[PDB]
Amino acid sequence: KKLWQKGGGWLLEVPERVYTPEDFDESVKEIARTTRTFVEREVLPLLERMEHGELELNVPLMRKAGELGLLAIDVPEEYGGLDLPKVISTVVAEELSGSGGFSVTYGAHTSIGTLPLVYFGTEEQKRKYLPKLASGEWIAAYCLTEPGSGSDALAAKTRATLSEDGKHYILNGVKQWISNAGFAHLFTVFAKVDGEHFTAFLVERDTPGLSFGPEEKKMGIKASSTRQVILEDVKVPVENVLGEIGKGHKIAFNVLNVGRYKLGAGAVGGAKRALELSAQYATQRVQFGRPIGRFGLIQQKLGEMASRIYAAESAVYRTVGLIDEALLGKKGPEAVMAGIEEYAVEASIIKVLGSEVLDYVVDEGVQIHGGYGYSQEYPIERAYRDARINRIFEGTNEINRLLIPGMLLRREDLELHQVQNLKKLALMVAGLAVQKYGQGVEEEQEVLGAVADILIDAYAAESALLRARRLGGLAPVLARIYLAQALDRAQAGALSVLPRLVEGDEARVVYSAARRLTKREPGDLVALRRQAAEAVLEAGGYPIPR
Amino acid sequence: KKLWQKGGGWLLEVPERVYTPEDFDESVKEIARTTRTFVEREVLPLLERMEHGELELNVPLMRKAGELGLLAIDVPEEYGGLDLPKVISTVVAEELSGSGGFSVTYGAHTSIGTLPLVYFGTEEQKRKYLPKLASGEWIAAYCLTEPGSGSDALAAKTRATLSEDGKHYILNGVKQWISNAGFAHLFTVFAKVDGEHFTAFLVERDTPGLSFGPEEKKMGIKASSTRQVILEDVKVPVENVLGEIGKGHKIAFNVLNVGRYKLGAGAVGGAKRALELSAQYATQRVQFGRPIGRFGLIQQKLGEMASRIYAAESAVYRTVGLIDEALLGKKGPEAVMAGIEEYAVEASIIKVLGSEVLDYVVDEGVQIHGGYGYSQEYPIERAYRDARINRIFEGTNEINRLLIPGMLLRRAEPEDLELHQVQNLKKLALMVAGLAVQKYGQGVEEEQEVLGAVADILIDAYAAESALLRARRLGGLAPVLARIYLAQALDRAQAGALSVLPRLVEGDEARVVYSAARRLTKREPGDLVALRRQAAEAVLEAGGYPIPR
Numbered sequence A: 001k002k003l004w005q006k007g008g009g010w011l012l013e014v015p016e017r018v019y020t021p022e023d024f025d026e027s028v029k030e031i032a033r034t035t036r037t038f039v040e041r042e043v044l045p046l047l048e049r050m051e052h053g054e055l056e057l058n059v060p061l062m063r064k065a066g067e068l069g070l071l072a073i074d075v076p077e078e079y080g081g082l083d084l085p086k087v088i089s090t091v092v093a094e095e096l097s098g099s100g101g102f103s104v105t106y107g108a109h110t111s112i113g114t115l116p117l118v119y120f121g122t123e124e125q126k127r128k129y130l131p132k133l134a135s136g137e138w139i140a141a142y143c144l145t146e147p148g149s150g151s152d153a154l155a156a157k158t159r160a161t162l163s164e165d166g167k168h169y170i171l172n173g174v175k176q177w178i179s180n181a182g183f184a185h186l187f188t189v190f191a192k193v194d195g196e197h198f199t200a201f202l203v204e205r206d207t208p209g210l211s212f213g214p215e216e217k218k219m220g221i222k223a224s225s226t227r228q229v230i231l232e233d234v235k236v237p238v239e240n241v242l243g244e245i246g247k248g249h250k251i252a253f254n255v256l257n258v259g260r261y262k263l264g265a266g267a268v269g270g271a272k273r274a275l276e277l278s279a280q281y282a283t284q285r286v287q288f289g290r291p292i293g294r295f296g297l298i299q300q301k302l303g304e305m306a307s308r309i310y311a312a313e314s315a316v317y318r319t320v321g322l323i324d325e326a327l328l329g330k331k332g333p334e335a336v337m338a339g340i341e342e343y344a345v346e347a348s349i350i351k352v353l354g355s356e357v358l359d360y361v362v363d364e365g366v367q368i369h370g371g372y373g374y375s376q377e378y379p380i381e382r383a384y385r386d387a388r389i390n391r392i393f394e395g396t397n398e399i400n401r402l403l404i405p406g407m408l409l410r411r412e413d414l415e416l417h418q419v420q421n422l423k424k425l426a427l428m429v430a431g432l433a434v435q436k437y438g439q440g441v442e443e444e445q446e447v448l449g450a451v452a453d454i455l456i457d458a459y460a461a462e463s464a465l466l467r468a469r470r471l472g473g474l475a476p477v478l479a480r481i482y483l484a485q486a487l488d489r490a491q492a493g494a495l496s497v498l499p500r501l502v503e504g505d506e507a508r509v510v511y512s513a514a515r516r517l518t519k520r521e522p523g524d525l526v527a528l529r530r531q532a533a534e535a536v537l538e539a540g541g542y543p544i545p546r
Numbered sequence B: 001k002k003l004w005q006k007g008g009g010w011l012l013e014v015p016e017r018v019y020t021p022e023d024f025d026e027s028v029k030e031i032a033r034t035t036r037t038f039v040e041r042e043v044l045p046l047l048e049r050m051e052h053g054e055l056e057l058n059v060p061l062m063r064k065a066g067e068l069g070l071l072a073i074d075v076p077e078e079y080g081g082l083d084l085p086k087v088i089s090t091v092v093a094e095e096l097s098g099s100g101g102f103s104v105t106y107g108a109h110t111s112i113g114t115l116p117l118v119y120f121g122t123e124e125q126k127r128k129y130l131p132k133l134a135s136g137e138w139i140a141a142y143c144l145t146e147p148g149s150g151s152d153a154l155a156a157k158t159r160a161t162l163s164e165d166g167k168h169y170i171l172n173g174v175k176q177w178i179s180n181a182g183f184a185h186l187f188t189v190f191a192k193v194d195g196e197h198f199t200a201f202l203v204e205r206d207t208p209g210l211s212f213g214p215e216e217k218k219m220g221i222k223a224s225s226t227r228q229v230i231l232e233d234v235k236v237p238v239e240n241v242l243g244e245i246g247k248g249h250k251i252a253f254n255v256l257n258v259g260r261y262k263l264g265a266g267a268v269g270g271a272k273r274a275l276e277l278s279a280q281y282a283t284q285r286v287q288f289g290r291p292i293g294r295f296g297l298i299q300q301k302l303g304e305m306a307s308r309i310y311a312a313e314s315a316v317y318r319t320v321g322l323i324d325e326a327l328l329g330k331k332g333p334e335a336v337m338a339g340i341e342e343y344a345v346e347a348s349i350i351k352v353l354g355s356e357v358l359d360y361v362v363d364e365g366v367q368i369h370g371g372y373g374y375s376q377e378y379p380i381e382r383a384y385r386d387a388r389i390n391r392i393f394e395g396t397n398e399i400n401r402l403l404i405p406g407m408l409l410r411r412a413e414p415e416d417l418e419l420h421q422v423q424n425l426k427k428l429a430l431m432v433a434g435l436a437v438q439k440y441g442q443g444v445e446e447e448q449e450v451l452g453a454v455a456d457i458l459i460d461a462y463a464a465e466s467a468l469l470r471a472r473r474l475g476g477l478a479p480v481l482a483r484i485y486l487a488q489a490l491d492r493a494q495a496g497a498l499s500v501l502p503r504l505v506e507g508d509e510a511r512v513v514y515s516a517a518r519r520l521t522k523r524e525p526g527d528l529v530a531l532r533r534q535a536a537e538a539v540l541e542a543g544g545y546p547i548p549r
């Protein structure tokens, strides 16, 4: 409703409330512990065997996750589901996404593999498929991407031709990088009827003509199964058509929303796990008669890691909190999808923010381990390789940076003040871009990108601050650290693209306006970062208590 | 002995000239071509097999490189070497960045493996070792690092005691991460006599008591052999003592200078390869009915990549060019080491700059390939993994960042405005460095964050300047690449200086300093979008690094 509580509304009015992890009720904390115990003695123990080929172990693990209720969170109760708030589904992603590639096995099943059926599945379809997906008896896979089509999903080339008796749809094509392909019982495949209508198709594993290429040799997440799905004259019952023929884009787009914030959450969990390894090793490794964790350059890293993680975590749950708020007393796939679509920009922001925060965390984590961070014997080595795929998933970060500004171009507390100034700078640059390129503003990708980065930092900075005022303790420091640098990036980012939007003398005032919108007093990043570092070493990881 | 020529002289005065890549005399352009041929026809064809176990293929490859004279470049003539200018061994390092792990095999051998003998090798021990190393008949290894000691190399605890006889030394200890250990014939090992005198020793592979752990499993450079070397009562002839007892630190410190600039050149080479791969893929991959290379965000990456590579490349060869001149009319280990040591600071700067530029280039290279960049079937995937080790090798970038400010701590109007901004960066560094000293004094070492921000300014200064001065001679796209780098360097300078200044000054005095830091980094907004797009177009046009061979 209110202009501030609506999607992207934070861009004009400050939120009068923000959901933080300190708001997790007892049911959320209960499941987080359940998940933590689950990965503690079920996933981690088989991780090494899985990283070495025994991908089939993903099957008995998904069954236990199912028996724990972790596979029925986002499933309607009338189909074996628990239908719980998105925060529960989110915290689960967070806690599961730090033990290994099993996070992708779980992620592909619970989101893209299951949601399409929940959002567009007919009664019969949901009755004979969902129960098994929520229990874990069956594992799902999503088949959209193809060799010559990825970011441009709607370009799939797989063909669907109606059989002579019109009782089946004959599919022919090749699916690229399909998660869970090695053992999924159900496949949601995308093909074009007569080569013209992008459509979704429920396809069972035991179907003639359906084969799979060998496991892909990847940089990371080796514990996850990824194969090419080959469809050669695969007859699919006409009743297995998911959604509307020609309207398969509707399924693809809607699931992406959940994939996004879910990934943001997982990135936070992995970043936290990586910080644990770094903090513990910074304490345990001694060089030059001193634990390296006591060296200025190591503290700088640890403090920065804690700061970015805190900012991303705040943004993620603030986003999820808004979503659940909107889903209150709201039933029906249409209503559910709409509620979520409301914060699509927020979803893209945290996904870009989270993936990138985790990139820094695992990078510096390796650095802290020195040569050892380059050994397969150290878990940090695996974290570095596994984290690289995140900037590609749920739409690459480039595609997401192009979407974030979308809903902006025709579609006293000093720190808080500066946050509001960040918002104004985004609007300013955004406006100047449109008042110069009009319709073809989407061509100026570099301009949109700069806008998106300011928006991401604005949202991130505000989430960190607002939460810091409520939490207190170290929180304010971690927020100050983030905001300081967000201001640095904003000024530089704006000055790198503004010259492209204006010139002459009319630009002179524009640049000055920017310098003013990003004005602030320099903070002692040295002192602040060390303070956070001390807290990190003292806690052996993320310094913010549960 | 001019003012600017001296090590760090570019900090007080402007250089009268800089050695650039287009200043390569035919001799250099020759060996470079030989290396390129050696890689495409010998090394590359075997890369896959070596990355899958057959590490012994390094032996025949090393023999071939030896017959080509690539292993004798930095070796004295009277020992089967060619004793050529450092520029040559540097370009060879750069061109070998396409051999994958073999680059480490070659690098460890020619630098840490051979140099110790060349620098401190006794007359007789150089005749019976150097010839084989220079020919490739014998592969050398360097054993300094230990499980408990890495950055603090001198903390090694491998012990050495003189036998009753007095003719041999008994070695006991463990050396960690030894490149070439799987097939090396000669080993330079560091130990302390009676646990107090850091000393280097020559140990032949076939020496009883010396064993090796299994091949280390790492994230990258799998084509390289890396094993743990164990010493259980190893007998070493007294004459096998390399250098002077207790002065083993000298060997370790001098080899690091060469390793750093050769690595910086290596990183530049790897970056170019990653760029070729990225440019090529950007032209072939079509999404949304158009080559991705036509989209703004991809062009931004391609432009930034070419810009950072140009800066690093300019700084690297300018550095080596200085060393070479300071080496003219000089022979002997002592003179050559002091000549190279003169630019220890520059070596560290290009070491940090190179590895960080390559890091960025392979990362965006992976991004450009989307999912396929995560696939072992695409070379960009291996390059991302192989690159990671560079920020650790030759001293971690943290250690190097602490060394750069060293010299700056040993003390207490338009017209070519671009070159002026470069001068201000130099001033910026001096301002911060000074304030740090006039506050913490002799204890300024503990303020590593402060030293790091100072080092990052010195790095961008040297790089930008070296990039700008070359653009003036080179012309063409050069100026554009130099401008792209300069603008960004100034932004990083302001942010960095201001992120460590509140630590040195406070109150009213602090505000004055803050305004000075800003003016010293004040610049006029440049259109990076336009400039990067211009570089991109050139990249896609040249299919990689736009600057002509």
Ligand SMILES: Cc1cc2nc3c(=O)[nH]c(=O)nc-3n(C[C@H](O)[C@H](O)[C@H](O)COP(=O)(O)OP(=O)(O)OC[C@H]3O[C@@H](n4cnc5c(N)ncnc54)[C@H](O)[C@@H]3O)c2cc1C
Pocket: A285, A287, A288, A292, A293, A295, A296, A297, A298, A367, A368, A369, A370, A371, A372, A374, B108, B112, B141, B142, B143, B144, B145, B148, B149, B150, B151, B152, B176, B177, B178, B179, B180, B218, B221, B226, B389, B396, B398, B399, B402, B448
């Ligand atoms: C593939 C490979 C090949 C190798 N080949 C060889 C070889 O041929 N010969 C050989 O001798 N060795 C070799 N090594 C090993 C290399 O020399 C060591 O790995 C390196 O010196 C180890 O440093 P470390 O890992 O022990 O530092 P840690 O990994 O012990 O260091 C972690 C830290 O360095 C910290 N640090 C250290 N000192 C300071 C300080 N004073 N101030 C601030 N921060 C500090 C960083 O900030 C960070 O916290 C090789 C290693 C690898 C991985």
Ligand SMILES: Cc1cc2nc3c(=O)[nH]c(=O)nc-3n(C[C@H](O)[C@H](O)[C@H](O)COP(=O)(O)OP(=O)(O)OC[C@H]3O[C@@H](n4cnc5c(N)ncnc54)[C@H](O)[C@@H]3O)c2cc1C
Pocket: A108, A141, A142, A143, A144, A145, A149, A150, A151, A152, A176, A177, A178, A179, A180, A218, A221, A226, A389, A392, A396, A398, A399, A402, A445, B285, B287, B288, B292, B293, B295, B296, B297, B298, B367, B368, B369, B370, B371, B372, B374
């Ligand atoms: C481990 C793994 C698991 C996977 N699991 C699944 C799964 O379960 N189901 C599934 O369907 N798929 C899956 N995929 C594949 C994933 O969906 C595709 O890899 C992704 O969509 C591919 O994009 P691409 O690689 O084809 O882009 P390319 O790699 O084709 O894209 C390169 C480019 O995207 C560019 N780009 C594209 N459009 C634009 C634009 N408009 N503006 C600016 N830049 C643009 C970037 O800038 C860059 O140049 C998985 C992949 C991996 C690696």
